[PDB]
Amino acid sequence: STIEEQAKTFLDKFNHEAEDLFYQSSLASWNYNTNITEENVQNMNNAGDKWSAFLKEQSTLAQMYPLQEIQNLTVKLQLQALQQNGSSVLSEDKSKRLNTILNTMSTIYSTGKVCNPDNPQECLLLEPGLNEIMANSLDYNERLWAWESWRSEVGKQLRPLYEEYVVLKNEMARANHYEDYGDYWRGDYEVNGVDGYDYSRGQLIEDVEHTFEEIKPLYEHLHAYVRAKLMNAYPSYISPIGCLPAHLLGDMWGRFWTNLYSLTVPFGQKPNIDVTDAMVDQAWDAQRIFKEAEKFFVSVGLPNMTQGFWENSMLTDPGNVQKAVCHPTAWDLGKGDFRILMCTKVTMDDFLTAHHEMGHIQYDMAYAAQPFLLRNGANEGFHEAVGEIMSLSAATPKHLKSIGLLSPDFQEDNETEINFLLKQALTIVGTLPFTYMLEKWRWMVFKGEIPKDQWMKKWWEMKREIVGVVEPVPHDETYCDPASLFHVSNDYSFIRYYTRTLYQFQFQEALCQAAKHEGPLHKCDISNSTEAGQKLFNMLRLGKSEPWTLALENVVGAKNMNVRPLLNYFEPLFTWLKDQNKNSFVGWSTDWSP
Amino acid sequence: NLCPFHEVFNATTFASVYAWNRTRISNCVADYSVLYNFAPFFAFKCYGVSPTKLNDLCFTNVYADSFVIKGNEVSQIAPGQTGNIADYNYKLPDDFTGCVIAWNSNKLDSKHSGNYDYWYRSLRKSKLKPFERDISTEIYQAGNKPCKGKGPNCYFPLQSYGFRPTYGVGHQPYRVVVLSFELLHAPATV
Ligand SMILES: *[C@@H]1O[C@H](CO)[C@@H](O)[C@H](O)[C@H]1NC(C)=O
Ligand SMILES: *[C@@H]1O[C@H](CO)[C@@H](O)[C@H](O)[C@H]1NC(C)=O
């Protein structure tokens, strides 16, 4: 027996034992999530423990099969995924120190509170109070105070921990046969072994830079329009040259511009459509929303849903008794068990989130036939892309009229189209430069181009030249302003959302192209079209067996990231913005200072 | 008299797939109403004999096997199939004459904590010829070194079935009762 054959009969035993231990870990986590109790915290913890022990003994037994002799691509991929040394390559004391620093980071971010003003009893937490006060506010002073206080209370206590964490992670990545931690994170978008479809981390960086260069005009026009609109409501605070204050932008970190609609509406006389009253008038319960979503999914061409999805999964809040958490998640236990955890009500947001989670559920049912180590999307932006394309298809006015949530006599005008396009743009195209800047800063900090003693000034410089927002007040180098974000302090990657948007617009364009739709792209609908469903399922069933450069090619005909469909989606909005800000200035100059 | 068909479908427990149980039902008057009266069947196929024409046919030996398998592995109980069951556990001849009856049993074969009392064979040196039993738990050597016990490149041939009531439909227990009809030159008694 050769090595390919030993690898094959070792990978089958892993598969069996692993599916059992993962079902037990995941059922234990659901029972905790649906019902919070110490027994439930205890069992979640014991099952997680047994799973981590299995994984490590199998990655210490899976080190005896070299990859230089394995020929099969799937076996090579599984062995590569199972041969990762991980954090175990570090020393025991160093590993313990890194784990403790990560734990204390999570604790300080989660339980961080600002209570200095007035009496100490005036305590404001992040989620209940800070986000609420940042979402809507009309006073400059309170927003500036909240921004500065949160930035201080985060950075002053988190910078040395971040420095130690960066040093330890860089050392671990270097010891893990890499260059730095940024290279380790970029190793996900890597294909090697198949001719014609090959990728590299530097290629990913170049592609991201090229796409941002191609997309910058639209963001420049949108930023100019937003600044012009904000000038009137907030006078004597923004210079026309550009560089709006970072704090005075809506969200606390300015990740999204969603809450700026109240100040940047094109036409206030025509309100956006809503069907909350229509849903509540026909006595629409929590079951009917999911029934309609399943009906749409089966009308597209995808299969139905199992009974266990209906009897086991819970879709409504259980009241004061048996408290739980409401975070919409599509659970996949693994042994034919698919569940959804979310509490729903009569709202458009829940109506769209039902389709969004059903997309993930359909993806899981599609790729459940693959082996255990190949049951995932091709990239991290593949699941969200499918979810958002289903959500986009489910929100068109034609679909709403067809299903029965709107009167048949309703008519659509160009003003409503412009309003919808601006609402979409404030969320999608307004969050790409921030993600790109943050990821570039993290990559440069990890790899080493950035001096240790020069961390804040260069961050503000990049924010000024790339994003186009200046600091409201000067910040000395002691601060650790980037660390205030949830993802950076909790060791998460950020390029996933950029990649997800770029993939999802291409997916939507390709899918509704095959449905024989004539007209604007933003009005495309996939209902009652089996060809598009079959084309989508052809890539859905693949899972992680094939490289993403081939799964992407199988649907859109191109094997690389593209920005042309994104620009095609926002073409009427681009024309309207070009026609609008012809009198005001376009672009920003970083010469402005407080 | 009556054939002992009731005691096969009404058994309190069913043997595992890797060690199935065969009973001869010769020397009795065939009725088949017992098998036609039971619970709805997830699958019901007969190759070679018409379902209705079973009353007037005279046979000398009627065999009745019984085991428990999963839901998506039921389709491997047929002549000319490839899989984990048809190769190492239970194989039917290419020339077959009988009925294959299966029905879901989730209420009786689910302990809510792992019903590990059902086993199947996943590793074997060679495939199984039709109607053969192999009950052995000897260590399977997948390497090039003699095996001194469980460890690297040495696996336990059997694999347990873990059944729970919350599983899907293809991972739920299914009780299978095939009825092989044997015709011989000896006078028929059934
Ligand atoms: C067997 O038959 C009895 C009565 O004939 C019935 O109550 C029972 O459900 C059947 N099945 C089992 C497994 O006992
Ligand atoms: C199973 O087969 C054995 C002989 O192999 C027989 O004695 C027994 O009655 C059969 N049934 C059960 C339930 O053991």
Residue numbers in the entry:
A (entry chain A): 19 to 612
B (entry chain B): 334 to 482, 484 to 524
Article sentences:
KP.2 and KP.3 carry new F456L/R346T and F456L/Q493E mutations on the viral receptor-binding domain (RBD) of the Spike glycoprotein compared to JN.1, respectively. Mutations observed in these lineages, especially F456L and Q493E, are located on the interface between RBD and human ACE2 (hACE2) and are shown to affect the receptor-binding affinity and substantially escape the Class 1 neutralizing antibodies (NAbs). RBD with ACE2, particularly the synergistic effects of F456L and Q493E, we constructed recombinant subunit proteins of JN.1 + Q493E, KP.2 (JN.1 + R346T + F456L) and KP.3 (JN.1 + F456L + Q493E) RBD and determined the variants’ structures in complex with hACE2 at a resolution of 3.30 Å, 3.30 Å, and 3.29 Å, respectively, using Cryo-EM.
While in KP.2/hACE2, Q493 of RBD binds to H34 of hACE2 through an H-bond, meanwhile, Y449 and R498 form two H-bonds with D38 separately. In this case, we infer that R346T substitution does not visibly influence interactions and that KP.2 interacts with RBD similar to JN.1 + F456L in the analyses, which is consistent with the experimental affinity measurements reported recently. When F456 is substituted by L456 in KP. Meanwhile, the E35 of ACE2 springs back and loses contact with RBD Q493.
